[PDB]
A paper describes a structure:
Furthermore, we determine the crystal structure of the [name]/[name]/[name] KEOPS subcomplex showing that [name] becomes structured upon binding to [name]. We obtained 1.9 Å resolution diffraction data of the [name]/[name]/[name] complex. [name] is at the center of the complex, binding on one side to [name] and on the other to [name], which does not directly interact with [name]. The two helices of [name] associate with the N-terminal helices of [name] into a helical bundle. The N-terminal peptide of [name] forms a β-hairpin between Met1 and Ser20 and the region between Gly25 and Pro50 forms a helix that lies parallel against the β-hairpin. The β-hairpin of [name] aligns with the β-sheet of [name] to form a continuous five stranded anti-parallel sheet. The association mode between [name] and [name] is very similar to that of the yeast Pcc1/[name] complex, illustrated by their superposition (RMSD = 1.4 Å).
The t6A biosynthesis pathway consists of two steps: firstly, the [name] enzyme (Sua5 in yeast) synthesizes an unstable threonylcarbamoyl-AMP intermediate (TC-AMP) and in a second step, the KEOPS protein complex transfers the TC-moiety from TC-AMP onto the [name] substrate. The eukaryotic KEOPS complex contains five subunits [name]/[name]/[name]/TP53RK/TPRKB that are arranged linearly in that order. [name] is the catalytic subunit that carries out the TC-transfer reaction and its orthologs are present in virtually all sequenced genomes.
Residue numbers in the entry:
A (entry chain D): 1 to 20, 23 to 50
B (entry chain K): 2 to 335
C (entry chain B): 60 to 143
Write the structure that this text describes.
Amino acid sequence: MELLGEYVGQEGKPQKLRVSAPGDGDPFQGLLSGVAQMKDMVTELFDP
Amino acid sequence: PAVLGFEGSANKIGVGVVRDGKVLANPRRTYVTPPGTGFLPGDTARHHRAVILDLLQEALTESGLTSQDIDCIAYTKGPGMGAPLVSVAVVARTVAQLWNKPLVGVNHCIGHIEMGRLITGATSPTVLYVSGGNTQVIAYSEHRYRIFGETIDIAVGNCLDRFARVLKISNDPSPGYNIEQMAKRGKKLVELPYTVKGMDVSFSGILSFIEDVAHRMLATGECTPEDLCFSLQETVFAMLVEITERAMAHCGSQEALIVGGVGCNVRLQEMMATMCQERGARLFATDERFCIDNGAMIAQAGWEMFRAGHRTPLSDSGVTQRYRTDEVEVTWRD
Amino acid sequence: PHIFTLSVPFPTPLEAEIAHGSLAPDAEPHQRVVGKDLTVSGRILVVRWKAEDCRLLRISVINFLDQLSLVVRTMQRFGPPVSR
Ligand SMILES: [Mg+2]
């Protein structure tokens, strides 16, 4: 359905990450794509 | 029973299949880094993740066995590098659950010992376990592989590997093997510290000494890199022979078995076999297929463990970077 | 403390349970600095991180996603799970 990450710093300000279908395609292929996309968002969130 | 074994505690990744004393498959890959560099946990775990599933299917296909022909899944619980141990364990745990098979967490040293005992047919030897990660003198007694002697700092293989890095010697097929080939051409014996501590050994001092002797050579050139490979081997192997002999004498052992990556070295084998000859003892040594870390050694120790009633529930399957040889209850021996 | 929560959906509750069974046993390498907790409800795997350091929290989350990707590839290539 949806892969999501929620970061809450020591300040208390919450930052959300999310990756966007159960159709004819392979379910694990879709999940692998989401995980790879989540790695990019986590990198982008923590780098600055 | 047939056991599927997973190994990737250092820079070697392998999947083995063992069935009633027969190795049915043993594919393996080695993570080779540029000369002068050492493999890091992060990059090593990345290499292992990229090839582990290819090795698993290679092992299944070569063995002729399918998922449901496998009776047990064995994997290295430890010791070793953190990131690579976790990557191998997550796969072992997944296939165990998928196929609904039991799981057995194996101690890396017991893997080497059990494979050593299977291949060579050693009855009651004094065991010398030498690699890049370990240096121990072991003897089986009352359901324990007891540590009689060991390195108090770095493993003998770590001393050899780091010396190859300072001389910028190739890591292909292994820094150890290339040190060994260079040592054969050595003509001058350079004196080095001899640091035996009763039944224990030390290699930190020898490595720092030979590092300084190497930097002296690149600047003055009194000797050759071949002389230093020869000299390092003569010192570290004579020290390993001494502590093995001291353990053999204290237990009345008539057999000696060398296991681990450094056990591949024909010069160390020659030196140990000579000490054994003068004592009236036998020297046992495995070949290139099994001296280096491999999945079949894990499947073999796993086979012994599974039959005796050892099981690792998933909740207790967590890997340990420190797992001592004497911490396993050897219930498969009398 | 620095907190990170990850929610991962799986095709079936059994595949979520298998991923939990495979990923949960390992202790974090720097336990005093970064800790994590894994739970599973239905098809959802929930990972909860608590950290003292931001860089080591990023490293832990990235390392986990790489292990999760490997587990997903294992289930795809060597599955489906046999009936039990
Ligand atoms: Mg080894």
